[PDB]
Coordinates of C-alpha atoms in Angstrom, one line a residue:
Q1 CA -26.0 1.5 -17.5
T2 CA -28.5 -1.1 -16.5
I3 CA -26.7 -4.0 -15.0
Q4 CA -27.0 -7.7 -14.0
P5 CA -27.8 -8.7 -10.4
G6 CA -24.8 -8.1 -8.2
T7 CA -23.0 -5.7 -5.9
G8 CA -20.1 -3.3 -6.3
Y9 CA -19.2 0.4 -6.4
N10 CA -20.6 3.1 -8.7
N11 CA -19.5 6.7 -8.4
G12 CA -18.1 6.2 -4.9
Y13 CA -21.3 4.6 -3.6
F14 CA -21.9 1.0 -2.8
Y15 CA -24.8 -0.6 -4.7
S16 CA -26.6 -3.9 -4.4
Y17 CA -29.0 -5.2 -7.1
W18 CA -30.7 -8.6 -6.7
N19 CA -33.8 -10.4 -8.0
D20 CA -35.3 -13.9 -7.9
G21 CA -34.6 -14.3 -11.7
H22 CA -38.2 -14.1 -12.7
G23 CA -37.5 -11.0 -14.9
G24 CA -39.3 -7.8 -15.7
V25 CA -37.0 -5.6 -13.6
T26 CA -34.6 -2.9 -15.0
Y27 CA -32.1 -1.5 -12.5
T28 CA -29.8 1.3 -13.5
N29 CA -27.0 3.2 -11.7
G30 CA -26.8 6.9 -12.1
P31 CA -24.2 9.6 -11.4
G32 CA -23.1 10.1 -7.8
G33 CA -25.7 8.5 -5.6
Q34 CA -28.5 8.3 -8.2
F35 CA -30.1 4.9 -9.1
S36 CA -33.2 4.1 -11.0
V37 CA -35.5 1.1 -11.0
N38 CA -38.3 0.4 -13.6
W39 CA -40.2 -2.8 -13.3
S40 CA -43.4 -4.2 -14.9
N41 CA -44.9 -7.5 -13.7
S42 CA -41.7 -8.5 -12.0
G43 CA -40.7 -11.1 -9.5
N44 CA -39.1 -10.1 -6.3
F45 CA -36.1 -7.7 -6.3
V46 CA -34.0 -5.5 -4.0
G47 CA -31.9 -2.7 -5.4
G48 CA -30.3 0.5 -4.2
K49 CA -27.3 2.5 -3.2
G50 CA -25.6 3.1 0.1
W51 CA -22.5 2.2 2.1
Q52 CA -20.5 -1.0 2.7
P53 CA -20.3 -1.4 5.5
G54 CA -22.9 0.7 7.1
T55 CA -22.7 2.2 10.6
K56 CA -25.0 2.7 13.6
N57 CA -25.2 6.5 13.7
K58 CA -25.1 7.5 10.0
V59 CA -27.4 10.2 8.7
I60 CA -28.7 9.2 5.3
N61 CA -30.3 11.6 2.8
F62 CA -32.5 10.4 -0.1
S63 CA -34.4 12.3 -2.7
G64 CA -36.3 11.6 -5.9
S65 CA -39.5 10.0 -7.1
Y66 CA -41.1 6.6 -6.2
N67 CA -44.3 5.4 -7.9
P68 CA -45.2 1.8 -7.1
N69 CA -48.1 -0.1 -8.7
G70 CA -48.5 -3.0 -6.3
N71 CA -46.3 -4.5 -3.6
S72 CA -43.2 -2.4 -3.1
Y73 CA -41.2 -0.6 -0.4
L74 CA -38.8 2.4 -0.2
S75 CA -36.6 2.1 2.8
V76 CA -33.1 2.3 4.4
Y77 CA -32.2 -1.4 4.1
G78 CA -29.3 -3.3 5.5
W79 CA -28.0 -6.4 7.3
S80 CA -26.1 -7.2 10.5
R81 CA -23.9 -10.2 11.1
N82 CA -23.8 -12.0 14.5
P83 CA -26.7 -12.0 15.1
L84 CA -28.0 -12.3 11.5
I85 CA -30.6 -9.5 11.2
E86 CA -32.3 -7.9 8.2
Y87 CA -33.5 -4.4 9.1
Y88 CA -35.8 -2.0 7.3
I89 CA -36.6 1.7 8.0
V90 CA -39.6 1.9 5.6
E91 CA -40.2 5.4 4.3
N92 CA -42.9 4.6 1.7
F93 CA -44.7 1.4 0.5
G94 CA -47.2 0.5 -2.2
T95 CA -50.3 -1.7 -1.7
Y96 CA -48.9 -3.7 1.3
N97 CA -47.8 -2.4 4.7
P98 CA -44.8 -4.7 5.3
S99 CA -45.7 -4.7 9.0
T100 CA -49.2 -6.2 8.5
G101 CA -49.6 -9.1 10.8
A102 CA -46.5 -8.3 12.8
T103 CA -46.3 -7.7 16.6
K104 CA -45.7 -4.0 17.4
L105 CA -42.7 -3.5 19.8
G106 CA -42.9 0.2 20.4
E107 CA -42.6 3.5 18.6
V108 CA -39.9 6.1 17.9
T109 CA -40.0 9.7 16.6
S110 CA -37.4 10.8 14.1
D111 CA -37.2 13.3 11.2
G112 CA -40.7 14.5 11.6
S113 CA -42.8 11.4 11.9
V114 CA -43.6 8.5 14.3
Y115 CA -42.3 5.1 13.4
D116 CA -43.8 1.9 14.6
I117 CA -41.3 -0.9 15.5
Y118 CA -41.9 -4.5 14.6
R119 CA -40.1 -7.9 14.6
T120 CA -40.7 -10.7 12.1
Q121 CA -38.9 -14.0 11.4
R122 CA -37.7 -15.6 8.2
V123 CA -37.4 -19.4 8.4
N124 CA -34.8 -21.1 6.1
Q125 CA -35.0 -18.1 3.7
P126 CA -32.0 -16.8 1.7
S127 CA -29.7 -14.3 3.4
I128 CA -26.3 -12.7 3.1
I129 CA -24.7 -15.8 4.7
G130 CA -26.8 -18.4 2.8
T131 CA -30.1 -20.0 3.8
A132 CA -30.8 -19.2 7.5
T133 CA -33.4 -18.4 10.1
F134 CA -33.2 -14.8 11.2
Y135 CA -35.2 -11.9 12.6
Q136 CA -36.3 -8.8 10.7
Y137 CA -36.5 -5.4 12.4
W138 CA -39.0 -2.8 10.9
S139 CA -39.3 0.9 11.5
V140 CA -42.4 1.8 9.5
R141 CA -43.0 5.5 9.0
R142 CA -46.5 6.9 9.5
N143 CA -46.1 10.0 7.2
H144 CA -44.9 8.5 3.9
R145 CA -42.4 10.3 1.7
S146 CA -40.1 9.8 -1.2
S147 CA -37.3 12.2 -0.1
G148 CA -35.7 13.5 3.1
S149 CA -33.3 12.6 5.9
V150 CA -33.0 9.4 8.0
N151 CA -31.1 9.4 11.3
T152 CA -30.4 5.7 11.8
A153 CA -29.1 6.3 15.3
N154 CA -32.6 7.1 16.5
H155 CA -34.0 3.8 15.1
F156 CA -31.0 1.6 16.1
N157 CA -31.1 3.0 19.6
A158 CA -34.9 2.6 19.8
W159 CA -34.5 -1.0 18.6
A160 CA -31.9 -1.7 21.2
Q161 CA -34.0 -0.3 24.0
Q162 CA -36.8 -2.7 23.1
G163 CA -34.6 -5.7 23.1
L164 CA -33.7 -5.7 19.4
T165 CA -29.9 -5.9 19.2
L166 CA -27.8 -5.5 16.0
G167 CA -24.4 -7.1 15.6
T168 CA -21.7 -6.1 13.2
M169 CA -23.1 -4.0 10.4
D170 CA -23.0 -5.3 6.8
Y171 CA -24.2 -3.3 3.8
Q172 CA -26.6 -0.4 4.4
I173 CA -28.4 1.1 1.3
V174 CA -31.4 3.0 0.3
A175 CA -33.3 0.3 -1.5
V176 CA -36.4 -0.2 -3.6
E177 CA -37.8 -3.6 -3.1
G178 CA -40.8 -4.9 -5.1
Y179 CA -42.6 -8.3 -5.0
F180 CA -44.5 -9.2 -8.2
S181 CA -45.6 -5.7 -9.0
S182 CA -45.0 -2.8 -11.4
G183 CA -43.6 0.7 -10.9
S184 CA -40.7 3.1 -11.4
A185 CA -38.4 5.0 -9.0
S186 CA -35.4 7.3 -9.3
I187 CA -33.6 7.9 -6.0
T188 CA -30.4 9.9 -5.2
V189 CA -28.5 8.9 -2.0
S190 CA -26.0 11.1 -0.1

């Protein structure tokens, strides 16, 4: 059930699989909300299941295993149009804290941990509307985990209070992203 890069629907859930074409990634869709990624000396990829379009008060449940060997994240990942924003709610990462070198814009408590909030910018990088310059919003969990519940309303409200405004919501998935690393992960979304 391993597939090419692309999006669509599998077992009622929206999925989005993408990579830079380097190779070494194997993304598979499972039953219901299950999806599995296995990669060894890969390029950069983003894959996972969720909802298209996402909403601003959804409660997202994820469970399974996540074992990275290198640079990788596990997060609630999505975009917003107008303004163009790429947002992460990082639950667990590998060898690199994605917020390293980013300015901290506050904290929020949700689902049993404290999240630190950051903003970064991507200049002329690819996006859901083509090459653009856009901001990234990060909610990085302190107590890492590979299963549990995410109340996005807590993060989206905390972001709004600090001056980080989301526009119209695009896709919103539980994604495994990995940049030139190895690992395996099997996540079930609900």
